[PDB]
């Protein structure tokens, strides 16, 4: 049970990381502004700043409070 579970877990983690890498490469090479222009794809790059900022914030708060609670325990 333990072997099976943890093995499939690690497999999935690696797979997702690679998926993101390849999406980035799609941006760097195959992307075009003219066709994708105006639609949801463009709007993404439009609000990328707010996206990244809110992610940073949620991660930062989780870290703070979870660790602080553990060390108080």
């Amino acid at each position: 049970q333990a072997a099976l579970y943890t093995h499939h877990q690690y497999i999935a983690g690696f797979i997702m990381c690679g998926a993101f890498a390849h999406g980035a490469i799609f941006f760097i090479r195959d992307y075009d502004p003219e066709q994708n222009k105006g639609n949801v794809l463009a709007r993404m790059l439009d609000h990328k700043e707010a996206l990244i900022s809110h992610l940073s914030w949620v991660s930062l708060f989780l870290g703070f409070h979870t660790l602080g609670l553990y060390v108080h325990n």
Binding site: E49, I52, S53
Partner: protein
């Protein structure tokens, strides 16, 4: 012709530039606009060579800086003494040392940190110290806490005097360059005055105070009973009673019949069976010897009369056929740069502290010292760490000088020049000798572990299978044991119970015993030597590739510290002598860690224990569990981690907490040691978008750390984590099991 020269009122005393941050650099003084400004401000506050270029200015600066350092030391010393006076069980420990444990640091009854107030005996509570001030003070002759009190007061006064002297000799009457250059006068003055008179007055204090009262304490008379030092001084009758020579005053010494004074100028050797310390008469004779030696030495160089030598003349007189111009110009380089002096002195200083650690654990000089194995271990490893750091700093500032203030013209065909020439042959040779030692020494251990886990211990490397014997060391030990019969016929014993001999124990506890040497110890010594050579290789490359390189031919002008030369010609990250010192520090840490591990396990396993024979704390598992890595890990580490990982609900909970914290920060360093500032700056920029959108962007622009800044913060954090972990572990474990 030498005399005293001085200049008046060079710099006033005002807060004007105190209100002007970064005044010392015309660059920084023009104001901050980005974050890294602060880093730089802190970074180069003391870089006097980059401040200005006046030798005399930098010189006055370093003089007053010395005075500041001194004042700080006096402060901390007075603090130790006052704490010992007011918050200690010192007098209880004086009454009984063997069962009362030193404790001076006490905690406050607050949110819950009072649980640490450990019952150390003497009806006292607090925290056990390891510094050994108790045994030191007993050795000296301090009985009344009044003495500790007045001592602390005097120390504080001295600190104030030091600060005042610094202020004066910087702002009012500053000296001049030649007066800083009178080196022959300086050596004569130091070697004669300082050390000679130190050892002399030391001998005096020992004789007239610390010898009698310690004779009495060891005789066992009540502590407070023992008379007072000034009474001992006044009444010659008492000292005559103690040592019948004292009745005769000084006339016999004057008449050169020194033999009669042998009553308390002894040559016993060995130890004192009641205290485990060395014989105080022996140390007094020792210090007298040192006193006269150094005072005679302080009469060497000529200062204002033709008698005496000229350092530069002596220097030039030594030239060799294989060497060309020999030692010419060195007197110049040394009379001109601070950094050469700093390099030499740090190197010697670190080596000396190492020797201090070794000698001190070898021949314990204080009463009841050998007892606290915790104190022994602590002192040893602390002084060893300090030595390692001082030596690495020696290397650093050596390379710094070489980059900055070397001059080629003055040294045409120099020892220095020809060394710079064949640097390549030298470095290649060192490389090979290192890799050879690495191969053999470490592959031995791996071969052992493989022969074990495979199921054929028949073919391992121990005292049982194919053997390896430190024949040389055993021979030397034998000879130093048998020496006094013939070599020093007037020596009554070996100078260390480690040469061989009986066992001295006190309070059911061993104080010393002859120490065995096994194939284990052979292999450990060789690992030591390998890692040492490797560190030396790193630093020697760091200095010999300072000015230029077969890769970068203009390394010199680029300064001592810089990130790289861009990705050019294949990527030039980490090419500065500063980075050399970086990595050298890394490997120094590794080596010192290993050596103190060796020491701890050897002691715990085969010297320490209690007498019944003896009962070694691990019963001697060492000589068979220390030649395999798995054995190392499990039987030593994973074993002794017990008390430190179960120290909760007790006054040792702090040690476990710090163990955890140290693991944490040690791992935390790795983000710094691995990341890259470009990513940091990009994320910073997105954060600035976030803030600024709310109109809360800071006026100080945010900039990610400089490359070298990232490197330095990473190394500092990593080292802190590692050394803190091992420190906490050592303390908790040894205090639990001893």
């Amino acid at each position: 012709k030498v005399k005293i020269a001085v200049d008046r009122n060079p710099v006033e005393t005002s807060f004007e530039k105190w209100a002007k941050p970064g005044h010392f650099s015309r660059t920084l003084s023009k104001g901050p606009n980005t974050t890294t400004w602060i880093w730089n401000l802190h970074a180069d506050a003391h870089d006097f060579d980059s401040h200005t270029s006046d030798l005399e200015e930098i010189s006055r600066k370093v003089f007053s800086a010395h005075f500041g350092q001194l004042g700080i030391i006096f402060i901390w010393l007075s603090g130790m003494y006052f704490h010992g006076a007011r918050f200690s069980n010192y007098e209880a420990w004086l009454s009984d040392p063997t069962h009362i444990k030193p404790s001076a640091q006490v905690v406050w009854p607050i949110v819950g940190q009072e649980i640490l107030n450990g019952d150390v005996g003497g009806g006292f509570q607090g925290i056990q110290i390891t510094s050994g001030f108790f045994q030191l003070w007993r050795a000296s002759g301090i009985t009344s806490e009044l003495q500790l009190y007045t001592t602390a007061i005097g120390g504080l006064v001295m600190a104030a005097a030091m600060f005042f002297a610094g202020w004066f000799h910087y702002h009012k009457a500053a000296p001049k360059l030649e007066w800083f250059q009178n080196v022959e006068s300086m050596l004569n003055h130091h070697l004669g005055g300082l050390l000679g008179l130190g050892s002399l007055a030391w001998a005096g204090h020992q004789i007239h105070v610390s010898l009698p009262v310690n004779k009495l304490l060891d005789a066992g008379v009540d502590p407070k009973e023992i008379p007072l030092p000034h009474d001992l001084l006044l009444n010659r009758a008492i000292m005559a009673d103690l040592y019948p020579s004292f009745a005769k005053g000084i006339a016999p010494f004057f008449t050169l019949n020194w033999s009669e004074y042998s009553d308390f100028l002894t040559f016993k050797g060995g130890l004192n069976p009641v205290t485990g310390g060395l014989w105080l008469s022996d140390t007094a004779h020792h210090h007298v010897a040192i006193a006269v030696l150094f005072l005679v030495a302080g009469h060497m160089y000529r200062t204002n009369w033709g008698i005496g030598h000229s350092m530069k003349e002596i220097l030039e007189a030594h030239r060799g056929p294989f060497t060309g111009e020999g030692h010419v110009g060195l007197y110049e380089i040394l009379t001109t740069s601070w950094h050469a002096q700093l390099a030499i002195n740090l190197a010697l200083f670190g080596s000396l502290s190492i020797i201090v650690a070794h000698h001190m654990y070898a021949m314990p000089p204080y009463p009841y010292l050998a007892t606290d194995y915790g104190t022994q271990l602590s002192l040893f490893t602390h002084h060893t760490w300090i030595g390692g750091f001082c030596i690495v700093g020696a290397g650093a500032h050596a390379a710094i000088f070489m980059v900055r203030d070397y001059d080629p013209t003055n040294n045409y065909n120099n020892l220095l020049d020809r060394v710079i020439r064949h640097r390549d042959a030298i470095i290649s040779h060192l490389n090979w000798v290192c890799i050879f030692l690495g191969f053999h020494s470490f592959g031995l251990y791996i071969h052992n572990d493989t022969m074990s886990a495979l199921g054929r211990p028949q073919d391992m490397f121990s005292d049982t299978a194919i053997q390896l014997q430190p024949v040389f060391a055993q021979w030397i030990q034998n000879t130093h044991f048998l020496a006094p019969q013939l070599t020093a016929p007037n020596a009554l014993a070996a100078t260390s119970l480690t040469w061989g001999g009986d066992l001295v124990a006190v309070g059911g506890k061993v104080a010393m015993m002859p120490i065995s040497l096994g194939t284990s110890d052979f292999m450990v010594h060789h690992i030591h030597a390998f890692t040492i050579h490797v560190t030396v290789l790193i630093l020697l490359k760091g200095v010999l590739f300072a000015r230029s390189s077969r890769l970068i031919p203009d390394k010199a002008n680029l300064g001592f510290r810089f990130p790289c030369d861009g990705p050019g010609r294949g990527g030039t990250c980490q090419v500065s002598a500063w980075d050399h010192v970086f990595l050298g520090l890394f490997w120094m840490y590794n080596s010192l860690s290993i050596v103190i591990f060796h020491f701890s396990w050897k002691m715990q396993s085969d010297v320490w224990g209690t007498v019944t024979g003896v009962s070694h704390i691990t019963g001697g598992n060492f000589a068979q569990s220390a030649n395999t890595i798995n054995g190392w890990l499990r039987d030593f580490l994973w074993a002794q981690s017990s008390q430190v990982i179960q120290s909760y609900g007790s006054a040792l909970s702090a040690y476990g907490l710090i163990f955890l914290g140290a693991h944490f920060v040690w791992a935390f360093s790795l983000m710094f040691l691995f990341s890259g500032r470009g990513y940091w700056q990009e994320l910073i920029e997105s954060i600035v978008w976030a803030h600024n959108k709310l109109k809360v962007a800071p006026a100080i622009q945010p900039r990610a750390l400089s490359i070298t800044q990232g490197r330095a913060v990473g190394v500092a954090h990593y080292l802190l984590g590692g050394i803190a972990t091992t420190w906490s572990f050592f303390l908790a474990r040894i205090i639990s099991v001893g």
